[PDB]
Structure formats: C-alpha cells, structure tokens
C-alpha cells in the first residue's frame with residue numbers, strides 16, 4: 001500500500017521547491033511537513049504519494065454535516081494520512097482520528113517591540129491600539145464562541161467595530177501591524193515565523209488557548225497509533241526541535 | 252463498572268483536603284486532577300474510585316522490563332485509568348495507552364527576577380551562576396540523554412560538577428534558588444506554580460523540550476479515545492483554562 005497523503009500549501013510546512021530541476025512526485029515539495037513525512041515513512045516503513053488537497057482547505061463543516069478540505073479527503077478514503085498543520089479539535093475527532101500532536105501552540109499577539117503592552121488584558125481595556133484577526137479563520141472562530149470575560153470584550157471590539165479590525169489574510173494582517181498601530185491575533189506558530197523574519201515585531205504575552213497539530217487519518221486507521229509512537233520518538237531524540245529550527249529560524 | 256483510578260499525591264494535582272470533616276472515598280481528595288476526573292466522569296458517565304498508587308511512583312522500568320508506579324497498576328489491570336500529571340512518553344506507550352494531553356509543558360528555568368539571563372544558552376556559557384535539577388528526575392534524565400550542543404555542555408556542569416548542582420527534591424531546589432545564586436531546571440508546570448507564589452522568582456526563557464500529561468489506560472482500553480474527546484471539549488469550552496487558574500493562581 002503506497003499511502004496517499006493529503007496536505008495543503010502553507011509556509012513553511014509545505015511549499016513548491018524553488019527549482020526548475022526535473023523534480024517529480026513528492027520531490028516537487030519541501031517544508032516542515034515534508035521533512036516530518038519523510039521521518040515518519042522511515043520509522044514506520046511506508047511508501048507515500050503527496051497530493052495537495054484539491055479545494056485548498058483545511059476542513060470545516062456546513063449546515064448539512066458535509067465536510068470539505070483535507071478532512072473530507074480522509075472521510076472519503078481518498079487519502080490515508082493528512083500531514084499538515086491541521087488542528088486536533090472536538091468536531092473533527094467526530095469524523096476522523098488524529099495522532100498525538102507533533103506541534104503544540106495557541107492563539108497569541110503579534111505587535112511592535114518597545115510597548116507597555118504585555119497581554120490580551122492590556123489590549124482589551126484600551127481603545128488607542130486597534131486589534132483583530134483574519135476573517136472566518138480559527139482565531140476569529142475562537143473569539144466568537146468564547147465565554148471568558150476578557151475575550152468576550154475583545155470580540156466586541158472585533159465584531160461591532162468590524163471595519164478597522166478584521167483582515168482578509170495573514171499577509172494583510174502583518175502589513176497592518178507594521179504600517180499602522182495594530183495588533184494581530186493569530187496562531188503562535190505563525191507569529192514565531194514572522195518575528196524570526198521581522199526584527200521590529202514581537203510576540204505579546206503567552207498563549208490565549210491551547211491546541212496541537214496532529215496527523216489526520218480515517219477513523220480506525222491502523223497507522224494512527226504508529227504515527228503517535230514515531231512522533232514521540234522524534235520529539236524525544238530532539239528531531240522535532242531541529243526540524244522546527246530548520247524552517248523557523250531567520251537571519 | 253466502577254472504574255478504579257490510580258493517581259499520585261502531587262501539589263496542586265492531588266492533595267488530601269485540609270479537613271477533619273467526615274469525608275470518605277473520593278471526597279478525601281482535592282486538586283486539579285480531582286476536578287478533571289469529575290468532569291471526565293460527568294461527560295462520559297462513569298462511576299469511579301480513586302486509589303493512591305501504593306509505591307508513590309509515576310512509573311519507570313528496571314533492567315528486566317519490570318514497571319513500577321501508576322504504569323504498573325495499569326499493566327496489571329489494578330486500575331482502569333491513571334489521572335495524574337503523567338507524561339506521555341515513547342517508552343510508556345509501549346506498555347499502556349494515553350489520551351491526548353490535557354496539559355502541555357516543557358523543561359524551563361526557575362531563577363531570580365532582574366538578571367541579564369534570558370535563556371539556557373546564557374547559563375551554559377558561564378560559570379558564576381550554579382544550575383542543575385532534581386536527582387534521577389525527568390529533567391535530569393533528559394539532559395543525560397541529550398545530544399543537542401548546548402544541553403550536552405549543561406549536563407557536564409551537572410554531572411562532572413556533581414556536588415553543587417543536583418538536588419534531592421522540588422523543595423530543596425527552590426530553597427537553593429532563593430537562598431543562593433542558583434537556577435533550577437524543571438517541568439514548566441511546577442515553575443509556574445512556584446512563580447505565582449514567590450514574587451521574587453521568575454521563569455527564564457521558553458520551553459527546552461515539549462511534552463504533555465495524559466490520562467493513562469491499559470493498552471486497548473475503550474475509554475482512551477472517549478477521554479481524548481472529553482479533554483478536547485473541556486479545552487475548547489475554556490474549562491481546562493479555568494481549572495488551571497483555580498489551582499495555579501497565587502496572591
């Protein structure tokens with residue numbers, strides 16, 4: 001069984017290699033998730049074929065119980081594994097299985113260096129600094145559902161003050177932080193990637209929530225627990241650290 | 252089936268309640284893990300009986316493949332669940348199963364406030380500040396096995412300079428940080444608990460490794476995945492955050 005692996009283009013997890021050399025199949029790609037997949041394939045001993053998710057989506061539900069993205073590929077048995085920065089969530093565990101996480105993270109704050117601001121509490125109780133997230137993304141969906149005191153007030157500043165708060169994508173959000181007095185809320189992994197590359201920018205405070213990226217499989221897959229074991233081995237032998245360093249470290 | 256739950260006395264996860272009131276069975280205990288177990292028991296719908304691990308150990312192997320502690324209780328089918336700050340590790344996954352983690356953590360540094368020291372790199376390349384860990388603990392075992400450049404040099408300062416480096420327990424280590432110019436390396440969860448209560452002390456740098464506490468079960472237990480689902484629900488509805496706050500927050 002050559003395993004079909006669904007994944008998604010996302011810097012620095014999965015990228016097309018910057019090359020016009022004759023590269024075919026898996027060799028067309030590079031990134032943290034390609035390195036991970038190679039290690040997994042060497043520990044477990046499997047052949048694999050990387051296929052980019054056709055709709056370019058992670059995986060969400062509609063009002064009819066219909067899934068899209070990598071999650072749908074798994075449900076439909078069109079992929080054996082999803083090796084991607086795919087968050088392990090309650091709703092997704094209803095329909096697919098996940099390895100234990102290979103990376104753990106949380107929502108955090110992207111902002112400028114040299115400011116008294118040290119937490120989400122500092123942004124919540126002031127008006128001068130504008131703050132928000134990407135529209136219809138994971139971080140927005142968190143703030144919308146939240147019932148925690150401080151994050152409810154923050155969502156009001158994002159929803160009722162809708163205009164100068166939310167952004168279209170990652171690129172525009174970072175643009176807003178640099179050019180204007182703006183703070184972006186997004187997944188801490190993305191924030192670390194940015195701060196390594198933009199020395200005027202820093203993470204503010206700790207993690208607002210807690211979650212992990214795991215390898216997705218169809219429910220009952222005999223690979224899930226084996227992948228957990230491989231992940232634990234890679235963590236303990238310092239290989240996940242080095243793989244993270246390879247892709248995240250800047251100039 | 253009234254589930255037998257193995258656990259271990261460890262502040263603030265599991266403690267005897269400070270009361271002479273007539274309290275029996277599970278009611279004798281309090282702590283983060285008791286609160287967690289109650290939530291799990293309400294989501295899954297099980298009855299349970301908390302039993303402290305007789306040997307008071309987490310679970311390690313000897314040179315014959317023989318286990319002790321909570322891990323042994325699970326292997327022997329004398330407990331259905333281990334609900335404790337029990338780290339999910341490669342070696343333990345050989346012999347028991349684990350839910351996905353309810354708490355994630357890493358090795359970090361406990362030291363005084365107001366010092367140029369900002370990482371493990373700062374401690375590694377200097378002699379003036381003494382640093383170590385608890386003898387034969389998780390953090391020591393990490394440094395001993397490590398092949399990462401900076402942590403190998405740090406282990407030399409702990410092993411070859413054995414006398415004024417390692418400590419007997421948590422209590423003595425914190426005592427060393429306060430009284431002498433000493434930095435303690437230990438699990439970040441423990442560090443946060445201490446810094447909330449000792450305003451002269453702070454965490455230094457980020458996390459040196461990455462790992463999680465999970466609920467242990469015997470291999471094949473039908474409760475493992477259900478517990479993962481309950482944990483994800485608790486995380487997403489902010490309950491793990493509030494439970495952490497309940498037990499960790501200081502004066």
Ligand SMILES: Cc1cn(C[C@H](N)C(=O)O)c(=O)n(Cc2c(C(=O)O)sc(Br)c2Br)c1=O
Pocket residue numbers: 010058059085086087088133134137138139140169170185186187189190
């Ligand atoms: C690597 C990565 C993956 N994902 C997808 C998410 N983990 C999922 O599984 O849906 C994200 O939402 N983020 C953060 C993010 C957003 C956010 O944090 O709100 S909005 C967008 Br577009 C992104 Br790409 C990531 O950085």
Ligand SMILES: Cc1cn(C[C@H](N)C(=O)O)c(=O)n(Cc2c(C(=O)O)sc(Br)c2Br)c1=O
Pocket residue numbers: 261309310336337338339384385388389390391420421436437438440441
């Ligand atoms: C809550 C908790 C549990 N454990 C046990 C460990 N998680 C395991 O599963 O063995 C720890 O080692 N630590 C840190 C620790 C040590 C360390 O970090 O080296 S040494 C000792 Br005695 C402890 Br109690 C914890 O803080």
Ligand SMILES: [Cl-]
Pocket residue numbers: 098099100228349350351479
């Ligand atoms: Cl699992």
